[PDB]
Amino acid sequence: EIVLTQSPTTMAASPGEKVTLNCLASSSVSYMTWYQQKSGASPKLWIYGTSNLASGVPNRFSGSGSGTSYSLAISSMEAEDVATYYCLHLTSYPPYTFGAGTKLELKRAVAAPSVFIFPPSDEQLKSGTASVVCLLNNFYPREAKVQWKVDNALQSGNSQESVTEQDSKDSTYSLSSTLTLSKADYEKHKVYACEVTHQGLSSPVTKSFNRGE
Amino acid sequence: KLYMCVCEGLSCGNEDHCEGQQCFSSLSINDGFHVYQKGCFQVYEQGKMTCKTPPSPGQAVECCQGDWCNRNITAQLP
């Protein structure tokens, strides 16, 4: 049974930079197949044989290798190249094994998040629960700090975060933080604050509202 | 005279090992599949006298001597 080790697990490159992704095999194999997978999308054939590009794949891409060591290469890193790249073994009796994958990211200029706060909708309130959403829109890099405050009291253990994958167009991230409270709890308080810390901001940004205003 | 060989495919039911004078790694394009095989060759008084196969469109065979020699060899079509 063939085991494929991909290296590195992640790497971030500036626009124009040259990239090499490695695929090491536990035994000697004949040829190597490569796939590109974008977020919420199916894996597309990228390189077949060892060095053959699929149709629609830019000449910017390259394949090479022999025996156990195999590599995918990019001559110039672009924004549309942002994806996870998988190598696949095909040249033996089953099983046909994939590598772990290398997530490829694009190094970008520092972009400050545009911050938005959302009170729980009236419908939601009626139903008996309250969710307060804070949006961090179009930022780079991913590392962001969101802190919830309710009447100046720092919130803990009652919020959940989710980050989108790097945008294929502008290479930015977005973040959503949701503070969940029981309706009663929500009613009990007035000021609902979302405090955002990020590199693109010289000092932290607070978006807030008063309940019933 | 007899080596231990890796056994994958049709001739190997349903063992992973094999014993022969030569080990082989086999490939043929069958029914839209690149089917691979590994096993043994043994000389009898008649029939196939050679492990090595005259190349044909769609098929390739490569043979070896030594214990588990077929493990790190796979037949590749030209």
Place this chain on the structure above:
Amino acid sequence: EVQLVESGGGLVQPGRSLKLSCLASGSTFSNYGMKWIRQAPGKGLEWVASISRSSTYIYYADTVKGRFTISRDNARNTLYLQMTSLRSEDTALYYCAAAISTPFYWYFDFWGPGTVVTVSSASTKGPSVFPLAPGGTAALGCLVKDYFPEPVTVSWNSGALTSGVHTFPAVLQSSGLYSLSSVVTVPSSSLGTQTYICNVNHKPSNTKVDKRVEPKS
């Protein structure tokens, strides 16, 4: 050259059975071998099963061998995957793919959108859809809350609005239920005059919600 679409996926219980289907464009279907590849959430790709052009050769993964059965119907242009004795780690998005064979190489191609299979004791729950009501630019959205299993699909204005849309990955809450939000940034002048509707679909519960996100005072 050939389009493939997967179906039959949904919520299922441990130790129970399910049959996936892969419907082709055709009638080139009977010209290629067929493959199943699964993807667990947040994880890599794992090959499941293989079937040749005329069901001559069949292969299985070792974790799958004995439990699963790959079938084929060239007349109906459909690939099948019979799944039995289903486990917690069988929970994955299931792709079907055609094997392309050249005299030098072979590879997998034309992978479909996939189908979600979930194996758990927990039962089906539909999502509550809530408006995230609304600087030259204003942000608005929908909160898709408390659903099981995945997946949920969100569009804006029946697919007419795509630019500036961020649909966030679902978070599994402490309750064991999924929640996500989808947001869009629009000109603040377009508010009140243009109507924004998020279109939420959760096929496991057979729930469809269309939600007008209106700002008010």
